Every structure is written in structure tokens, then in C-alpha cells.
Design a protein around this ligand. Structure first.
Ligand SMILES: CCCCCCCCCCCCCCCCCC(=O)OC[C@H](COP(=O)([O-])OCC(O)COP(=O)([O-])OC[C@@H](COC(=O)CCCCCCCCCCCCCCCCC)OC(=O)CCCCCCCCCCCCCCCCC)OC(=O)CCCCCCCCCCCCCCCCC
Ligand code: SF4
Lengths: 97, 148, 113
């Protein structure tokens, strides 16, 4: 930022870019190292009612896997694991470099 | 009768009923159950418009705190907790979410105890929250205004 | 027109995709006729090959044929048909329509232990 205008023009011509507009070194635009104290918000479970843990106990909703067929327990169309992948559209922003 | 505000019709264990349902209510077990109350010892406590209703209910909960035998955890801890919350409610020192919190505390006490003192202590709080909830909210709002 | 590049490295562009596809599907059906009638692999592979062959015979345009096949590009479809034919030959060698070769021990697939 402390460069002379002749050196700035030489750098700009030699690089082909405006180097002074986007400087690599941070001078004053950064935030202050001393910040005001925060106040973090609370989540949805921070309520005094209608908040029984058994109504939001996601860890106990896990069940053992369902056995489709087993060697001891156990005209239709051929199927696939999923519907086939749709083709990606070419980007309308910048399709080629 | 126009000055009448509330009646506790079966002693302190039964909850309160306001004047509007006091107009045409009978003194049956079944009639008071339909009025969401009970006929207990047939003790008709009458409170007029000059009554501090929250103070009366908190005095009843303080009585239940003093007379709980302390043997079983829901009655012991929950009735003490209800007494503290009701004292703060009388002072106005709470927020309206604590009304729902107190309702859930009373529902946790009711039916989980050894004898029916827990039910008889949770019922007046249930009746007060069911009927005189805008009075509680008015007290909390007045406290919040005059303290900040 | 004719496709310039297929976009995948090492995949050559097919000048005549329809004839190659129909001979590959016909060969796959012919090798599927040697399977037992009760073979679920034979039934399902015959269904897949029949539907794909009907789509090739129905559509003479490469682009809308690709859109109908939904298997990427038509070169990818041709390669998949080659893989299916080689697979069907191997499945005929292997004979997996037979019953289970050996049941596992009783605690082999029990989790948690
Ligand atoms: C020919 C060019 C010679 C170098 C020159 O004049 O550079 C200045 C200057 C450098 O520009 P700059 O890179 O923007 O300066 C960096 C800051 O802007 C400004 O830098 P700063 O503010 O951080 O401090 C600068 C200060 C720094 O002061 C010192 O370095 C003093 C050292 C004392 C040692 C005892 O002073 C100088 O650099 C003055 C020039 C000293 C040149 C010494 C040459 C001989 C060296 C010894 C040989 C033996 O040159 C030009 O702008 C154009 C040069 C061509 C002019 C024709
Ligand atoms: S519910 Fe009955 S047994 Fe339990 S602490 Fe209260 S008074 Fe005692």
C-alpha cells in the first residue's frame, strides 16, 4: 500500500492486473482484534414445556435392519436400485474455459 | 353474588371454580367431576373479587409443602418446587412460559405418587392455571413493567 | 449429424450405433435362450434386452434414442450391452439358479454379538 505510483504502474503493467485494487497484505480492512462480547442464541429444546425427551429421542428411533430374506427365517418387473441418473446440464454461467 | 369470584367446593384438594360455572353447579360427585373438580369434604371456600387469588392458591400449596410426609420423591420434591414457583408467581417474578412449566410439573406429580396428597396438591395449581391464567399474566406483565 | 466426441477418454465414437446395438441385443437374447425357463436371471435379462431392443427399433435418431435409453451416451449403452452379453455367458457357466450351496452357522450374521 506504501508503494510509489511509478512502482505501482510498473507492477500493473508487468502483471496485467490492477494489483493495488486487490492487495495481498491486510492493512486496515480486517476486523478489530478486540471484539464486543457476544450473546449466543439457544436451540429449540430450550423451552420449559412441551419438551419431553421421549418426543425428540432420535437415538432410540434406530431399529435393527429389516430382513428381506434369510436362509433361516425366509411376472414381476425387473427393478433397479434407484431410478437412473439424470444427465447434468451444461452450465449457463461459464460452459467452457 | 356479583362480588363472588371463585369457590373451592370440596376442600383444598379439589381445584377452584369461577363464578360463571358457580351459577348453575350442583353438589354431586358427578356434577363436580363434570365441572372438572370433585366433591371432597364438602368444604365450600368462597373468595370474592377482593381476594388475592394467586396468594390464596400459593398459601394452599405452602400448606401442602408443610404437610407432605416426604416419603416419596414426586410429592416431596415437586410440591416444594410448586411452592417456590407459586411464591414467585404471587410476587410476579416469573415469565408466562413458567405457567406451562408449572402445569407440566403438576401433571408429573399427579398419578406418580404413593398416596393422593400429590394429586390433591397438583389439582389447585391445575385449577388456577385453567381458570385464572390472564390474572397471572397480568401480574407478570405489571412486575416486568415496574421493575424495568 | 454425427457425434464429434463422446466426452469419455478411451471410448471411441460409433458411426453406426443402431446396427451394433441390435446385433448385440439379438446375440444376448440368443444366449439367453439356453438358460432354464425358471431362471430369474433369464427372465429379467430377457425383459431388459427386449425393452431396449424395442427402443432401438422404434427410434432411428441417436439423440432421442439416448434420451429414451437413459444409459448415458449410446456408446455407453453399446459397452453395457457387451458387458451384459459376457455376463450372461458367465452366468450360464456358473448356474446360480440352483438352491443355496450351504447355510451359514447360526450366529454368522447376528449383530450385535
Ligand atoms: C534507482 C532506484 C534506487 C532505489 C530507490 O530510490 O528506491 C526508492 C523508490 C522505491 O519505491 P517503493 O518500492 O515504492 O518504496 C517502498 C516504500 O514506498 C517506501 O519505503 P519505506 O517508506 O518503507 O522506507 C524507504 C526508505 C528505507 O531507508 C533505508 O533503507 C535506509 C537504509 C540506511 C542504511 C544505513 O528509503 C529508501 O529506500 C530511500 C532509497 C534508498 C536507496 C539506497 C540505494 C543504495 C543502497 C546501498 C548501496 C551500498 O524508487 C522508486 O519509487 C522509483 C525508483 C526509480 C527512480 C528512477
Ligand atoms: S404423596 Fe403421600 S406418600 Fe408421597 S410424599 Fe406425599 S404425602 Fe408422602
Amino acid at each position: 500500500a506504501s508503494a510509489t505510483r511509478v512502482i505501482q504502474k510498473l507492477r500493473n503493467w508487468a502483471s496485467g492486473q490492477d494489483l493495488q485494487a486487490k492487495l495481498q497484505l491486510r492493512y486496515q480492512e480486517i476486523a478489530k482484534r478486540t471484539q464486543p462480547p457476544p450473546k449466543l442464541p439457544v436451540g429449540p429444546s430450550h423451552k420449559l414445556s412441551n419438551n419431553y425427551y421421549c418426543t425428540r429421542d432420535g437415538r432410540r428411533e434406530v431399529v435393527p435392519p429389516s430382513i428381506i430374506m434369510s436362509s433361516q427365517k425366509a411376472e414381476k418387473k425387473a427393478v433397479t436400485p434407484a431410478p437412473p441418473m439424470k444427465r447434468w446440464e451444461l452450465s449457463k454461467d461459464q460452459p467452457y474455459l | 353474588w356479583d362480588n363472588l369470584l371463585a369457590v373451592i367446593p370440596g376442600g383444598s384438594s379439589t381445584p377452584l371454580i369461577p363464578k360463571s360455572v358457580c351459577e348453575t353447579v350442583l353438589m354431586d360427585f358427578d356434577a363436580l367431576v363434570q365441572a372438572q373438580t370433585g366433591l371432597g369434604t364438602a368444604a365450600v371456600i368462597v373468595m370474592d373479587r377482593s381476594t388475592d387469588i394467586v396468594k390464596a392458591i400459593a398459601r394452599l400449596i405452602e400448606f401442602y409443602k408443610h404437610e407432605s410426609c416426604g416419603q416419596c420423591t414426586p410429592c416431596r420434591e415437586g410440591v416444594d418446587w410448586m411452592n417456590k414457583v407459586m411464591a414467585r408467581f404471587v410476587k410476579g417474578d416469573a415469565r408466562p412460559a413458567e405457567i406451562d412449566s408449572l402445569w407440566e410439573i403438576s401433571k408429573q406429580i399427579e398419578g406418580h405418587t404413593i398416596c393422593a396428597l400429590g394429586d390433591g396438591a397438583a389439582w389447585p395449581v391445575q385449577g388456577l392455571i385453567r381458570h385464572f391464567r390472564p390474572e397471572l399474566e397480568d401480574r407478570m406483565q405489571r412486575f416486568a413493567q415496574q421493575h424495568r | 449429424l454425427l457425434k464429434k466426441t463422446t466426452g469419455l477418454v478411451g471410448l471411441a465414437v460409433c458411426d453406426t450405433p443402431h446396427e451394433r446395438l441390435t446385433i448385440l441385443y439379438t446375440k444376448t437374447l440368443d444366449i439367453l435362450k439356453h438358460f432354464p425357463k425358471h431362471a430369474a436371471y433369464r427372465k429379467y435379462t430377457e425383459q431388459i434386452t427386449n425393452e431396449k431392443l424395442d427402443m432401438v427399433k422404434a427410434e432411428p435418431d441417436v439423440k432421442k434414442l439416448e434420451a429414451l435409453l437413459q444409459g448415458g451416451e449410446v456408446e455407453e449403452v453399446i459397452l453395457q450391452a457387451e458387458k451384459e452379453l459376457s455376463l450372461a455367458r458367465k452366468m450360464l457357466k456358473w448356474k446360480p439358479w440352483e438352491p443355496l450351496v450351504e447355510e451359514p452357522p447360526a450366529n454368522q450374521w447376528k449383530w450385535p454379538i
